[PDB]
Amino acid sequence: MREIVHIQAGQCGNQIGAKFWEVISDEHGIDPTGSYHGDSDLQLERINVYYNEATGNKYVPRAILVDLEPGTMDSVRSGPFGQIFRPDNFVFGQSGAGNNWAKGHYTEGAELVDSVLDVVRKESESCDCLQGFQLTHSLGGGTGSGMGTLLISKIREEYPDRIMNTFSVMPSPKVSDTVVEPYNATLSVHQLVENTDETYSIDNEALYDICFRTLKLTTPTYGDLNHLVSATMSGVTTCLRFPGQLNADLRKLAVNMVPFPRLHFFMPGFAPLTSRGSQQYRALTVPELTQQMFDSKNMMAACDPRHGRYLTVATIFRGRMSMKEVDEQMLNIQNKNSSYFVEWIPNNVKTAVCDIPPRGLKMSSTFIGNSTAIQELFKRISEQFTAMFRRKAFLHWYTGEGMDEMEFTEAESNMNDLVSEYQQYQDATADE
Amino acid sequence: MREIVHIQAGQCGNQIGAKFWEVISDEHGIDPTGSYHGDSDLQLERINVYYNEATGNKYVPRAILVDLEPGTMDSVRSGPFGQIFRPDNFVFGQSGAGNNWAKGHYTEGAELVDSVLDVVRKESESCDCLQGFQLTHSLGGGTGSGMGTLLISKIREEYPDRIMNTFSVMPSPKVSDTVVEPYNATLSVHQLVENTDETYSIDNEALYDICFRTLKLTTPTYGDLNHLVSATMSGVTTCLRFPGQLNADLRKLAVNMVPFPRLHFFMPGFAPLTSRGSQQYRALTVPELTQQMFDSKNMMAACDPRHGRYLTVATIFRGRMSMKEVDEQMLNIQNKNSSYFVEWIPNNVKTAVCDIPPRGLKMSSTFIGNSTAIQELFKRISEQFTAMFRRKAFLHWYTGEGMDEMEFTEAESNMNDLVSEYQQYQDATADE
Amino acid sequence: ADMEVIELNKATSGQSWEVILKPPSFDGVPERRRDPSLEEIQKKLEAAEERRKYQEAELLKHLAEKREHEREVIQKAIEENNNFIKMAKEKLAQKMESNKENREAHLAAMLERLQEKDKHAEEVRKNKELKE
Amino acid sequence: YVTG
Amino acid sequence: MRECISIHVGQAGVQIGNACWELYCLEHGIQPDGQMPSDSFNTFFSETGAGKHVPRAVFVDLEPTVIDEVRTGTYRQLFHPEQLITGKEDAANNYARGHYTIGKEIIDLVLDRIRKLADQCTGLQGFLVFHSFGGGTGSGFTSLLMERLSVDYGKKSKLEFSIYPAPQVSTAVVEPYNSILTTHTTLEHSDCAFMVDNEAIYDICRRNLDIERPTYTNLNRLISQIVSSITASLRFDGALNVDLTEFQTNLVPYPRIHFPLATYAPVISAEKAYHEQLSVAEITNACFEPANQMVKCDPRHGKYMACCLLYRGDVVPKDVNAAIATIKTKRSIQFVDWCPTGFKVGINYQPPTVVPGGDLAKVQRAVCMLSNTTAIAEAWARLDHKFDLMYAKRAFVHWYVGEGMEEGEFSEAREDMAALEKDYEEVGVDSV
Amino acid sequence: MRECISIHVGQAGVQIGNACWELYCLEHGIQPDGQMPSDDSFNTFFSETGAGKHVPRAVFVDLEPTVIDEVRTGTYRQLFHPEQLITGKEDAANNYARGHYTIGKEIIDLVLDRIRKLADQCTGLQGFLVFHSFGGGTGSGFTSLLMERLSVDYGKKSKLEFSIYPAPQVSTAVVEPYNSILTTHTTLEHSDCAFMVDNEAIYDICRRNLDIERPTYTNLNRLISQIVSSITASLRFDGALNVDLTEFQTNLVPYPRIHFPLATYAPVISAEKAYHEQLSVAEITNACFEPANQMVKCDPRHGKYMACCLLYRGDVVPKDVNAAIATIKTKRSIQFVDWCPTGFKVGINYQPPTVVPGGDLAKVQRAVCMLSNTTAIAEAWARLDHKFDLMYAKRAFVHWYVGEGMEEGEFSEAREDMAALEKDYEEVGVDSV
Ligand SMILES: Nc1nc2c(ncn2[C@@H]2O[C@H](COP(=O)(O)OP(=O)(O)OP(=O)(O)O)[C@@H](O)[C@H]2O)c(=O)[nH]1
Ligand SMILES: Nc1nc2c(ncn2[C@@H]2O[C@H](COP(=O)(O)OP(=O)(O)OP(=O)(O)O)[C@@H](O)[C@H]2O)c(=O)[nH]1
Ligand SMILES: COc1cc2c(c(OC)c1OC)-c1ccc(OC)c(=O)cc1[C@@H](NC(C)=O)CC2
Ligand SMILES: COc1cc2c(c(OC)c1OC)-c1ccc(OC)c(=O)cc1[C@@H](NC(C)=O)CC2
Ligand SMILES: Nc1nc2c(ncn2[C@@H]2O[C@H](COP(=O)(O)OP(=O)(O)O)[C@@H](O)[C@H]2O)c(=O)[nH]1
Ligand SMILES: Nc1nc2c(ncn2[C@@H]2O[C@H](COP(=O)(O)OP(=O)(O)O)[C@@H](O)[C@H]2O)c(=O)[nH]1
Ligand SMILES: [Mg+2]
Ligand SMILES: [Mg+2]
């Protein structure tokens, strides 16, 4: 469990993924050419996890960039740190997916799938010990949602013993691309339930609300939304990229975070909330940083944590701070809000501390929660799906690709079962 | 009946035996190198009984030193008379017995037994007429207890016509907190009943009490306890070592001391009770010397002689005294407390006098009693045994060596039968 | 009433005689064994040797039993250490194989589901094809 | 008990 | 020559191993390269033709990080490369992974190296296994190893030093599962086992050594001292020194009842005013103070079935006997009706040595109380409760089943724990 | 020649033997090397060699070597030939069965072979004088084995015993009553006349007369020696009474089983008892009836006499003796059995009682030894018989005898014979016809 293979799929997948690489390369002291220039050696210790060591003083991301459209990948290549990526790893098509899941999963996607798998094979065989895989994609479009889930199941066939972790963006009518988004997300969720080990639920509804209500940005852009995502990705990956709580990999996380197989969807969260580039920086204290753990306003998923119960929690603190002050603040929260943490999972809230703070921020805290409240996100998509499906609206776009109504009713059913399951453990009592 | 071969087995066996050799050599006028330096020729007249005559003026003890542990051999050889013993006679093992009788009797012991028997053979064949054997050992440990009794039965096979005499130390919780001691002692007693001709019961309970209550030593040491033992061993062997009334050996003693085969356990005693550093003035007369040696406080076995009856008694007096005064004081005791000497054994109390006194003491008296009161010692061990055995406590260490519960129940039964036998003659009256 | 000197013998370094003070108060009549033989004495001694050596032989018989007991206890200890190993070997092989079979089946079942999904995707492409 |  | 092989498994095993071997080296004057200037230490260290002293130990981990630190550390060169074994991926806190999946791939290699160390032994006493209850390797690999050592070495003695999980000192949610699973599997293969409650060490480090946030180095240096006290009797030839195997015979009355409670005193901080000195009565009183225990439980409301004292440094018999008294008059130390009272005492010549760069103060005299109490069953009860909470909802179970385990294995392990609890109940009730 | 063979068995037998042969040598002028200075009668006890050496017609036996090794190295080493001093390796350890059965069987043929050798040197062998203790394993067991064998090889030749009777104050071991009865029963028919010597009686005389508060075996044996030479003076010199061994049976033994005479001696004066006047006949005669001078502790006043011999030694004239009998007769009882006459068989041996120069006994011009057959002797058997009954009732020590091949039935048979002997001593004393 050393090396992780990253995969970027679709417009959102490549956009979000590009920013993750920009951020992490900066954190590891890597310039846009691929050479190291950092101060402390702790930047190099766990470099092998995300970076390959090329001929000479170079470090190349273990990333595979995928799309059925040429557009985004060209813009990424020209963008900051776009030159850092392996040119052979750019697996692109020309037809596109037309924000249609079926085109990505069955039509256009199935024609490009093997080309991608050839690049995943090459990267996998150059690993001393393959930890697992990480995919960045949206569930709203066609390439990320359809081809992304098709990539997951195909990888799952070849590497059943490897961990599959995803950063999945959930659609919202508040910030949208197409009317069909609830169909694409419902068809994708079904796949993620079956084939992923861990999924970070990045909700665009929550991202829009943070930018609008909190950050006070009247017309939020994908850049504003992606700034929140990169912060969360940096934070959630810290223990894989830096030592301290070390001997911790993708599997140890899954084993301790997921009590039931299907319930592997995490509610991410970050503190303090920041605007892109536009941060003047103010000292955020540890008790304040911990206060933004129960904060609904700090959640990357549009769910009220107080509407459910926590199965498991992982909290990561970054920057120079008293570790003693951290555990006592974490304990206070658990004792005061005991009704929100399941009694039948003793010591379910784990904390990690890293001396390296993110870019600009002197002190930060990322939150990873497995809360039953995430059913609010699934119910929202389910309601949007039924509204359309009840009147068979836009169905000919899907049946035209060879799909049947049976597949839709099934996707809906699994989505409803997942909700029942969350409720089942929300009501589950220890019998004191 | 001339030569005796001595055997010392285990920690206690070698410790007590080493002191016996130190004591007798000094009395016989032998230095730690093995040469004679004494005044009177009476020290030489019967030297052949315990010492072999080597090439030149060298007298070597007819002793065989045995242990399954090297520790004890190293200490004895460095000890005061360590250079007097025959180097070939040191039969010592590497892995010990772990204070487990089963290891000494069956496992580790049975692997070293033949090596010992080869040394006993060599010594036996260099005797004009083998009188018999004397073993020093404790019944509490594993080598002395287990291997010592295994040596006894194996010698018994080879030399059935020879006398087997033992100096057997009985365990006490007052001195040694090794829990299994009552098991080891019960298993040993069974063997001694069957295979020895004479056994001197050296009770650690009695030794501790003399040092503590009488000698006023708050924290008694093994050295304090062993000082009492060496005095007794010097006193009991006088008649075999000095021309103080000739033509008396190990068999004449057994014939006159043991009226019934199984009842061959003697209650030793010495007077006056001395301390290694107590500078005592030149005093003590025969009436007080006789009075001391018949008192419970002077017994080397924790039994009240007033609780039973004497089958037979042997008393040995040392130093320049009046023999007339001795016999008069002996019957004075007999006639005064007649209810404690069996009527059916006429003239059961025999006295011997020797002109040679021990080191420092101008006059002393050793007491050898065959009293039915010795059942108190056996009952004490039996009670300690049952307490543990009733709950099968520590049994796995014994069954682990191949032993069965049947062997334990049998050892207990023989111990109880021996008690019944003592009681049988305690109640026996010659009225019919 | 008196003393009578009957007189006996005489020699160079001695003299003997009888003194009859009072006569005897009475004068009258009272004032299979087939022993010894070397056969009787030796029969008594040989019978005594027989008794002594039989006791010695029976004493060795009891010790021969003790010697064979020690043999069965050393054997129990070895038979029990041998069986402990034997049981521990097969219980471990049983567990190792049982865990192999289970995991093998679980990874096969999950691959079978993925294969069924592949079959449906090939059926989807054919479903799209309608030449008219 | 510590004899010695 | 009565050799002992130390086996260190998983992170905790390896890390404690590093603290222990550093301390042993110091106590015997061995340098980090294996050299010593100008005996019983030969039981733990073997020699070469170069005069190099190599520990009779094997360090194992399914992951390379922890051992790589040893391979690069101060004590590199001390261990031969062959005795430090590592895998590529860890057991990820999963017992099933360490036992079957990952475990199966390294077991034969570990055994091959143990066989190599065993050929260098002319009288191997047994094994000392160091591991955590919580870790995937610490639990599953250790269980697998014990099962195999039983096959290869039959009845040969195996002792454990087990790390008991604590929330306040970095546990994981699944640690209660691994603890019970390993306990059940190892129970019949382990002859004796010393539990070390991480909360107890944590509490001593705070309430005595005055460290608010204790590190693993702080925790391990304290454990090291206690381990050194237990092993001192084996590594040193002392006059009044009682061997750990003699305490063992007193400590384990039934094969399953083999978990002694360990207590240590004095634990003084290096910074506090040294002038005060220390008395034998003070440390004996501290030996019964619950704050000094290695496992958090209550012996005061429980029964003893052995009570042993291990002294080291300047300790005299006169002081100890006075200390064993007075305290049993004041305090209530209830023993079982089938066990005698009386404490089994061992005194080693070698005083307690301290690491120069450490937080522990140098003392003239120190004590370690190993006692067999029914109170230890309270630690099992705490672990069992946490297991029951999670198991009722079958939480995390899928990770174990996914690796080849059966749900039935979970119930069997728990059934054995209930039997152990009932076994500790029955053992404390009085006889008839 | 009227020659006599002396046999000394066990420690006592050997030790008394040493005292006897020392006294004989002195009385006949024989030196410790066997040389003489030059009435012929001494030849009955000593044979001659080509060198003019006088060798005792004796055989010393012991199952152990210590006692005889002392003789082999002693003053009297150039007196006995090596072949006549026989030893074994291990003793009978106070066990009759060991001396008779176990250890005894291994040396008997050798002893008999040496007795046969001494017997071939005899032109008229009278018989044997056996010296032994009742208590010792050899003294009891070997002696009985020997007597049984001597009866087979020497048919009807006379056998006399000098037996040491056990006493608590004079050593003794717990099992001595057993050995005493066992030997008595076995030897009873193979003995013609036997003189018991109560160790308590010798001890007492050594305390009040010789003034030794703690008497040694040498003191005890030197006294026994004087009484033995009295009994043998008639054989060793040209005497007139008890001139042959058959004469002892004639002058003392009226029935085969009634063969235990009481011996009395006088005067027993200490060498350091100043230098007082010599007390003649009638004074020494009166001491012959004083119980304090007896060899066996019993009461002849209670008893009945059935024979009475007076052995006067030194300067004694018939005129004095008859006057001494006349004075002792009046007022004194001395009751005889109805069938026996009341009186004495008197004998004077002109040879004076000689004493060992380094001894504690005073030299006297005249001495006397009374040999009398009294019913009172049965009191000594009775004391022994009671001690045997005490132990035998509980079968105490019996296993040591059974372990050696003897049977429990042998114990009862021996005791039955002793009861018969007691009843025989009763029957003789009552009215005849
Ligand atoms: N006292 C102490 N406890 C430790 C140490 N390392 C880990 N632990 C404890 O042991 C448990 C962690 O198990 P580990 O030993 O780190 O895991 P592992 O045996 O290496 O097996 P994996 O799951 O494969 O990593 C927790 O309860 C930790 O608190 C250590 O060095 N000292
Ligand atoms: N008067 C006298 N009595 C003796 C002498 N030696 C031993 N006794 C007595 O005889 C008994 C001892 O028997 P021993 O003659 O010494 O024994 P043993 O015939 O040599 O036969 P073992 O048992 O084999 O030694 C005791 O009653 C002693 O008092 C002696 O020299 N003179
Ligand atoms: C490699 O990255 C991580 C890996 C893990 C944890 C974690 O959060 C602190 C991580 O950071 C995201 C982790 C998480 C949750 C737990 O349950 C609450 C747990 O017991 C235990 C853990 C981890 N253990 C500890 C002691 O923190 C192991 C896996
Ligand atoms: C070899 O050493 C001894 C041997 C014996 C005895 C004895 O104690 C006085 C010894 O000293 C221990 C002995 C003992 C006890 C007797 O009565 C119980 C007895 O009758 C007789 C004896 C002994 N005989 C005498 C005359 O004391 C024979 C054996
Ligand atoms: N947060 C975020 N969401 C995006 C971004 N681009 C597209 N989306 C969302 O992703 C969904 C459209 O998926 P997209 O990636 O653009 O289509 P695809 O290329 O066929 O996979 C909609 O729900 C959009 O709101 C982006 O840069 N950031
Ligand atoms: N009197 C005395 N008893 C001892 C001595 N040494 C040990 N013991 C006792 O002997 C028993 C232990 O037996 P030990 O000889 O030490 O074990 P072994 O070597 O296996 O036979 C316990 O009851 C101790 O109290 C000693 O020197 N003197
Ligand atoms: Mg680990
Ligand atoms: Mg003798």
Automatic annotation (TrEMBL), chains A, B:
| Subunit record text | Dimer of alpha and beta chains. A typical microtubule is a hollow water-filled tube with an outer diameter of 25 nm and an inner diameter of 15 nM. Alpha-beta heterodimers associate head-to-tail to form protofilaments running lengthwise along the microtubule wall with the beta-tubulin subunit facing the microtubule plus end conferring a structural polarity. Microtubules usually have 13 protofilaments but different protofilament numbers can be found in some organisms and specialized cells.
Q: Which organism is it from?
A: Ovis aries
Q: What are the residue boundaries of the Tubulin/FtsZ 2-layer sandwich domain, all occurrences included?
A: 246-383
CDD domains from the UniProt entry = beta_tubulin
Q: What is this protein called?
A: Tubulin beta chain
Q: Which residues bind Mg(2+)?
A: D67, E69
Residues annotated for GDP binding in this entry = 11-12, 99, 138, 141-144, 175-177, 181, 204, 222, 226
A Pfam family this chain is assigned to: Tubulin
The residues covered by the Tubulin/FtsZ GTPase domain are 47-244
CC cofactor:
Mg(2+)
Q: Which family does it belong to?
A: Belongs to the tubulin family.
Entries under InterPro entries matching the protein: Beta-tubulin_BS, Beta_tubulin, Tub_FtsZ_C, Tubulin, Tubulin/FtsZ-like_C, Tubulin/FtsZ_2-layer-sand-dom, Tubulin/FtsZ_GTPase_sf, Tubulin_C
Q: Which GO terms describe its molecular function?
A: GTP binding; GTPase activity; metal ion binding; structural constituent of cytoskeleton
State the function annotated in the UniProt record.
Tubulin is the major constituent of microtubules, a cylinder consisting of laterally associated linear protofilaments composed of alpha- and beta-tubulin heterodimers. Microtubules grow by the addition of GTP-tubulin dimers to the microtubule end, where a stabilizing cap forms. Below the cap, tubulin dimers are in GDP-bound state, owing to GTPase activity of alpha-tubulin.
Superkingdom is Eukaryota
Q: Which residues bind GTP?
A: Q11, C12, A97, G98, N99, S138, G142, T143, G144, E181, N204, Y222, N226
Subcellular location(s) of the protein: Cytoplasm, Cytoskeleton
Its Gene Ontology cellular component terms are: microtubule
What are its GO biological-process terms? microtubule-based process
Which UniProt keywords are given for this protein, alphabetically ordered?
Cytoplasm, Cytoskeleton, GTP-binding, Isopeptide bond, Magnesium, Metal-binding, Microtubule, Nucleotide-binding
Q: Tell me which PROSITE patterns the record gives.
A: TUBULIN (PS00227), TUBULIN_B_AUTOREG (PS00228)
TrEMBL record, chain F:
Determine the domain of life of the protein's source: Eukaryota
Catalyzed reactions: GTP + H2O = GDP + phosphate + H(+)
Binding of Mg(2+) 2 occurs at E64
Q: Where in the cell is it found?
A: Cytoplasm, Cytoskeleton
Q: Where is the Tubulin/FtsZ 2-layer sandwich domain?
A: 241-386
GO cellular component annotations, sorted alphabetically? axonemal microtubule; condensed chromosome; cytoplasmic ribonucleoprotein granule; cytosol; neuromuscular junction; plasma membrane; recycling endosome; sperm flagellum
Q: Enumerate the PROSITE patterns for this protein.
A: TUBULIN (PS00227)
* UniProt cross-references to InterPro entries, sorted A to Z: Alpha_tubulin (IPR002452), Tub_FtsZ_C (IPR008280), Tubulin (IPR000217), Tubulin/FtsZ-like_C (IPR037103), Tubulin/FtsZ_2-layer-sand-dom (IPR018316), Tubulin/FtsZ_GTPase_sf (IPR036525), Tubulin_C (IPR023123), Tubulin_CS (IPR017975)
Q: Kindly give the SMART domains that the UniProt entry links to this protein.
A: Tubulin, Tubulin_C
Residues at which Mg(2+) 1 binds: D62, E64
Q: Which residues bind Ca(2+)?
A: D40, E48
Sorted alphabetically, the keyword list is: Calcium, Cytoplasm, Cytoskeleton, GTP-binding, Hydrolase, Metal-binding, Microtubule, Nucleotide-binding
In alphabetical order, the GO MF annotations are:
GTP binding; hydrolase activity; identical protein binding; metal ion binding; protein heterodimerization activity; protein-containing complex binding; structural constituent of cytoskeleton
> Which residues are involved in binding Mg(2+) 4?
D91, T138
Sequence positions that bind GTP: 11-12, 15, 92, 94, 133, 136-139, 170-171, 176, 199, 217, 221
Q: Which family does it belong to?
A: Belongs to the tubulin family.
PANTHER family on file: TUBULIN (PTHR11588)
Job description of the protein = Tubulin is the major constituent of microtubules, a cylinder consisting of laterally associated linear protofilaments composed of alpha- and beta-tubulin heterodimers. Microtubules grow by the addition of GTP-tubulin dimers to the microtubule end, where a stabilizing cap forms. Below the cap, tubulin dimers are in GDP-bound state, owing to GTPase activity of alpha-tubulin.
- Name recorded for this polypeptide: Tubulin alpha chain
Protein source organism: Ovis aries (Sheep)
